[PDB]
Nicotinate-nucleotide pyrophosphorylase
Amino acid sequence: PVYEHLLPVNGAWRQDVTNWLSEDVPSFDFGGYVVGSDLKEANLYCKQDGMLCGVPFAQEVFNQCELQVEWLFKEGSFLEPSKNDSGKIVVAKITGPAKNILLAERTALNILSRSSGIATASHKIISLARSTGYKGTIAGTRKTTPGLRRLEKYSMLVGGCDTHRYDLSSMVMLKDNHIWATGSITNAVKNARAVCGFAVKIEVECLSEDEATEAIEAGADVIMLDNHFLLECSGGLNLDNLYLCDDIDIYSTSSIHQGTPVIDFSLKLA
Amino acid sequence: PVYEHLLPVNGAWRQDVTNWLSEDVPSFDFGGYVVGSDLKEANLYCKQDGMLCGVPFAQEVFNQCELQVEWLFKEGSFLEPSKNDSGKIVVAKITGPAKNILLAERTALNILSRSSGIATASHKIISLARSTGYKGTIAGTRKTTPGLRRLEKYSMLVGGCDTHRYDLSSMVMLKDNHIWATGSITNAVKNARAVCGFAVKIEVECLSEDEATEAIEAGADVIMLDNHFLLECSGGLNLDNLYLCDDIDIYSTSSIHQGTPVIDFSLKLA
Amino acid sequence: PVYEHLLPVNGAWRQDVTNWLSEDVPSFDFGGYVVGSDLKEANLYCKQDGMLCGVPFAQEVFNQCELQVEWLFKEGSFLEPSKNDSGKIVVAKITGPAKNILLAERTALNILSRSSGIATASHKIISLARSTGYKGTIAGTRKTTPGLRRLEKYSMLVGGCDTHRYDLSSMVMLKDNHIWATGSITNAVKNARAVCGFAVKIEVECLSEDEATEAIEAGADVIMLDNHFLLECSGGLNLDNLYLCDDIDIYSTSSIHQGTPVIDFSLKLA
Amino acid sequence: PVYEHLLPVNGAWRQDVTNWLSEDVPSFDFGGYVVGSDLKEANLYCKQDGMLCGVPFAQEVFNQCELQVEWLFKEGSFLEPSKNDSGKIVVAKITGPAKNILLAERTALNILSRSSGIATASHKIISLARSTGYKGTIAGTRKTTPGLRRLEKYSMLVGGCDTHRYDLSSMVMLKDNHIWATGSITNAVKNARAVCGFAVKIEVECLSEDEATEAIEAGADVIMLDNHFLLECSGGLNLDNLYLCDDIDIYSTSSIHQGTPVIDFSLKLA
Amino acid sequence: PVYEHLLPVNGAWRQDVTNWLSEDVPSFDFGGYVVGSDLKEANLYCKQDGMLCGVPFAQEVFNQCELQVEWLFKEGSFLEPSKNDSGKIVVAKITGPAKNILLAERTALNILSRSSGIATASHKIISLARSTGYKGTIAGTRKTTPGLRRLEKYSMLVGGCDTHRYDLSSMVMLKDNHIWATGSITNAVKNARAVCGFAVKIEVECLSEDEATEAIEAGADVIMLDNHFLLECSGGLNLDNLYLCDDIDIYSTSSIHQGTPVIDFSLKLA
Amino acid sequence: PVYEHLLPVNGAWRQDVTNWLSEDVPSFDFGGYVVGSDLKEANLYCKQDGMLCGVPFAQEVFNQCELQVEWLFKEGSFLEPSKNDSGKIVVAKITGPAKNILLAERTALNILSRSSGIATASHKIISLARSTGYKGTIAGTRKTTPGLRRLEKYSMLVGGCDTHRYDLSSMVMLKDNHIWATGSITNAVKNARAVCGFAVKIEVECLSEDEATEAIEAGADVIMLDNHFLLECSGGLNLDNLYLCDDIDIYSTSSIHQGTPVIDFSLKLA
Ligand SMILES: O=P(O)(O)OC[C@H]1O[C@H](OP(=O)(O)OP(=O)(O)O)[C@H](O)[C@@H]1O
Ligand SMILES: O=P(O)(O)OC[C@H]1O[C@H](OP(=O)(O)OP(=O)(O)O)[C@H](O)[C@@H]1O
Ligand SMILES: O=P(O)(O)OC[C@H]1O[C@H](OP(=O)(O)OP(=O)(O)O)[C@H](O)[C@@H]1O
Ligand SMILES: O=P(O)(O)OC[C@H]1O[C@H](OP(=O)(O)OP(=O)(O)O)[C@H](O)[C@@H]1O
Ligand SMILES: O=P(O)(O)OC[C@H]1O[C@H](OP(=O)(O)OP(=O)(O)O)[C@H](O)[C@@H]1O
Ligand SMILES: O=P(O)(O)OC[C@H]1O[C@H](OP(=O)(O)OP(=O)(O)O)[C@H](O)[C@@H]1O
Ligand SMILES: O=C(O)c1ccccc1C(=O)O
Ligand SMILES: O=C(O)c1ccccc1C(=O)O
Ligand SMILES: O=C(O)c1ccccc1C(=O)O
Ligand SMILES: O=C(O)c1ccccc1C(=O)O
Ligand SMILES: O=C(O)c1ccccc1C(=O)O
Ligand SMILES: O=C(O)c1ccccc1C(=O)O
């Protein structure tokens, strides 16, 4: 299957791209004026070892900028420009009006660099956990970049990680909960059921064998401990120590997506 | 003066906030239903040493969520929760309907964490360069987060760095330029002038004493070398070696804003 | 708990209201001009037996039209104006500038009439099924009114029914499936898992004891037959015969929401 | 002439379609991922006797989903799948990427079902009134579905009915009017004239031979009684009794558009 | 009555204002930063003889910029700063945060200057025609400023002129018409009727006593010659000669709104 | 170079066009219905002596209306229909569906007429100043048409004038300044620098040899007197007297863009 198929042929994610171009040109592209519309060719370079992510998003930038692009690698491919003499790898060949190419350049690269950075981070941690013989799942969180959530959750997937719920309207989560606030797990979980119905899971962030059981009792579908039912462990986990997984179902962490370094990309005309 | 005064009392940056809340609740907040509207109090904690940034943005989230907030620190303040027993510092006190508080929580913290991360990174590098006796400026770039540019450039400022031009519609930049493509620096710079006029500067990314001079000749306002007039050095600079500044006017780097770690923040009800 | 708490204090649902007012006044309200801003009082009448639904939505219309409203009944209340001499019941008392009241009037009533119609339909069918001793759930579908989905799903809830998944991004559903198209239930269900992760359920529309088992095998969370696991029966069910429920978990039908009659409402000034 | 020609080649009605697709896919189409992009063929079935309406709207969904569609019937055609062995009639043949077809499916059918339901209702009542030898007009109202007004008014037209004014910015209507509130019909009608000018009609909802005459006096273009000049009768009329038309010009009723049942439609791949 | 009452308390015209502020501040108000939030007072001056128009629009700018404003004149008032020593007249007194005042300044004045310019032009021509004893109407056209149509039509009204139809969706107009294109006036007018119904007038741009009669025949509500029924004369009319009115009902001209000079306005702090 | 190259291949300026079409057709084009889709040909006429401006904007209207257009003149061309027998000049040849042509007509012409009017005004004043041997620049201002700023600034350029800064986020301007309000030019200019950085100029509206010098001192890039550094004179200048230029760098005036007459354009089908 192809990840980019998760994206509806049309929808808001495409207006996002447009909005991002506007963000770069509120009133006039001077550079395009000076450069003109002559057809040119260009190479899109990956300049660091990592996983290529964001292809369809960058593609959308290339389409709205009316350019012809040929990708040399499939999304998900691991790139190692280091084990290259030049230290860079051409991942795509682009042709079109000069001005168009330069207008797409920054925005497109801001997409790839960040998308790949996350894909790469996710992949390192999932494969790292997989190497210890862990059979469970590594997921993300809702601590995403305001307005960039679709792109980031998508990169998590390509990285080989679980995205965890998408937003507050998806799987319910009754988080630490003194504030949740009165009744019970048992009535907080009943109310949640009452509204979310059968098609959406309910997760409870418990604190004791009792807590959990009361949730399993109420019918919670997932149990969050935070230091037919599913067990999730979350909180300050990272590619570090940290190897301390055990037979618990889920391990969530923002480290795969928030605050992560980027994978450098580049674009130069023939 | 107050940085947040750079933000127009009303404008698109406020619709952004709204859009970000929608991004978190496409259809129903189940958690708010279960939690209810009872008034509660909560503390907003900074959980890592760093500079507090994003106050007005987080404030906008708190206003649209109709809450009462009292900030204990001014934006820009350096926080050191490490030199605290608990390892966390209350930066704001919030009151309002339970559901409202929990709805604002994630989005608000995604703002602060990232805004502060950048503010912090910028501040470290500017102060680091300042300690060596450098008198010039450290700037950012256009390699920003798609759709988050306003927030990121703003954080650069608070961090104590220059933002450099904002977008393609601001200071012109005739970048590496074989593609720029024919004529001269001299006619590329003339055309640019022809369109941008006197109120906006023109920068040329040169390669030789000649290149530069030809630009200084054409009237360029800034000279980019990239390894009454101004000299900018850019490319792969970071908090690392790297201390190799000299009397050149500008040093630009994405390290102060792109791929930077985040400053952890937290929110819990009384 | 209060249903209207499912709605985020702020989000796109409020811009919807605005857009709906624009839909009614593309360029000038002549009636408001002629009527003026004198303060007036008005009664909002329910003119048919049914369940009151859409309160917060109508409230939003009243707020943006800057009016003062006092509701005499809570959302969900069953109204029986028939068992009233006048044949109408005042559900709300409104005060404000004349023009404002008349501008809010139609839009507000279009909300209530439809919201209540659905609430009422849903309630009749759920209570009807409940009277036969059925313990399972009655749900809706995705056959909603383009652009009005939030309002309609919400009314389903108030009606006492399950909303079923909200959109294609929620619970996965592998519907009739020749088109789904090759591999297996088993690999269609694996791929779905691969993308949706643990926080979202997967439903398969099966055709045989085998089909189902293969799904239960693959790990499907729900089984749709369409004439720890859950059984759903769907297709042409209505308040009619039709009483033919049995111990299967879910019965979905658009009859509770699509093509339903409306509950008449009214508004007249003192 | 062709009804769909009423729709501007481009305008907001097309963004509506997009918005409706977003409404169905806030973040990821899982089904498309699993199904893939292989080309498939499909039949669009009408499953109930009624008039086909909404063609260009459904077409817009098919275009934005990049599919090839061939319609077998013209909009307005009366369909009678009942007088068919299978009980269904193929109204369109569609080809394109699997995922695209399934993404367009629901939204498209929600359009057709509702559009046809209204077209059908309108047509039944207009033809019903026409059979008694009535020569006047049957119109709709402003009690439309919030945000769907364009689609519904359009269906009224295809149904063979008058749409009546479109919104508050069109023909003025001085409705029951104690609230309209002081002066006269005569000065309310003068003020209205004062603002609307000659290109837009003014209607007054009168109560007595005097009322009307005073309006005809003031220059009203239409007279609404509500139980060179035109007479309109409105209020609780329906396909029921109700045959009680007489030589009055207009009979308005929401029954042709609000609360109406839908015409079932269907889509299955080869 | 009050003209500004034509504007719905809420609707798209208010988002327009916001959008206009964004147009002035894509990323940062530097001036506000430097000026600060200290409360200041300011006078809004009219600097040329003319009619004050655009009050509610400017008011909306002042509200979104959170300022306190007190108007010294009612909209429509004729101002003659020339017959003043200073040559300027204070039309409004404003108070609020410094930065806010300066941010509202330009946008607000761009509103007033243009709105008043049109109001003034319209008023001169209507009163000019009225002085010759003409009893008919002077109207505008659809040759308005892209995106500013609401503001301009509104100013026409205040100027004392007719706005004529608002857009293509209002009164139908079968303009010069070889292109309209085949059949007849008689079938073009029938088709138009067929779609627009009774609540909207149909105008035909005729060329001969026959043309007109055929239209009056078909049922046209207005007759446009262009050099119970109504006669309109249009084409190149202006405040110039040009006094050549006669007993024909309407005289339309863009001169009252398009290409018109502006009325200078000003704003300075205490 | 080509001016229209200043416009990004895609961005908000294109949504503007769409929005402008919606502004003309909120609900139904009756005229298109009656006219039909038959292919027709048409000539776009310039009806007054002036400079052709707005080509790409009008082109965008023609593209969204799906028409084929062939321009007979390049943007910037000076047209003199007066020195033509007919008194009109065909500037473009258009082909496409009848309805489409008529729908594009008004909006397109509203673009050209205004764009050319400004281009023409600007050109007259720049060439007028150039004829006296002035070597400096003539610029515009921020007194533009709300929402039309991009189109107007663009026309200024084609007219051969400087646009001056675009918005408040570009070149800083510390205008009359009692309100700016305390400290100094020297600290207002320092604060401005502090936020705008090196890539954006700072202009100070001075009053005395001292004022200026203090600014030149603080580092201002431009000096505005208003009756390596640059001198600007602004205030009430026009094509009138007024020839009183001297060796000062800039002369700004709204006369080239605000309140200017329009250049008449026309469109008729074969
Ligand atoms: O990998 P990590 O980034 O630690 O993310 C996971 C943790 O974050 C959440 O709590 P948190 O207290 O951080 O929510 P808050 O920031 O809104 O208060 C969650 O319950 C996890 O414990
Ligand atoms: O601190 P840094 O991130 O190195 O950013 C600064 C460098 O990036 C730019 O070139 P680059 O070749 O990166 O532009 P591209 O990525 O679009 O091709 C710029 O000319 C600088 O040399
Ligand atoms: O209560 P009801 O309205 O019957 O809704 C429920 C039925 O509709 C769906 O199939 P359907 O074949 O109707 O989907 P389609 O219309 O897109 O092809 C679904 O599988 C159910 O069988
Ligand atoms: O066919 P019907 O649905 O009866 O629609 C027609 C009636 O509705 C209107 O009054 P109504 O009192 O319903 O307006 P309101 O609901 O806003 O108060 C109108 O004056 C008609 O009498
Ligand atoms: O006062 P005025 O500006 O002359 O406006 C009025 C005239 O403009 C229209 O025709 P026109 O041929 O101008 O329409 P076009 O510009 O789209 O072809 C209209 O039929 C009037 O004759
Ligand atoms: O060519 P002109 O239209 O005169 O434009 C130029 C003048 O306008 C500005 O001041 P102004 O006092 O007009 O700003 P205000 O209208 O906002 O108060 C500016 O300082 C110039 O002096
Ligand atoms: O964002 C968070 O706090 C979070 C952290 C870990 C898992 C899930 C979530 C979530 O909210 O969905
Ligand atoms: O984004 C970049 O490539 C860039 C890098 C360094 C300085 C400035 C910029 C800029 O484009 O403004
Ligand atoms: O809309 C449908 O076809 C549908 C019908 C019954 C249940 C669920 C759904 C759904 O798609 O979620
Ligand atoms: O919506 C209504 O109340 C209404 C009812 C009947 C005719 C016309 C209308 C109308 O408002 O245009
Ligand atoms: O804009 C025009 O061409 C026009 C000119 C004169 C009157 C009316 C109109 C109109 O179209 O409504
Ligand atoms: O708009 C103005 O007041 C103005 C007037 C003259 C030059 C520049 C400007 C400007 O603000 O940029």
Observations:
- Residues 141 and 254 of chain B are 6 Å apart (CA to CA).
- Chain B touches chain F at residues 1, 3, 6, 137, 139, 157, 162-166, 169-171, 191, 194-195, 197-201, 203, 222, 228, 230, 249-250 (CB under 8 Å).
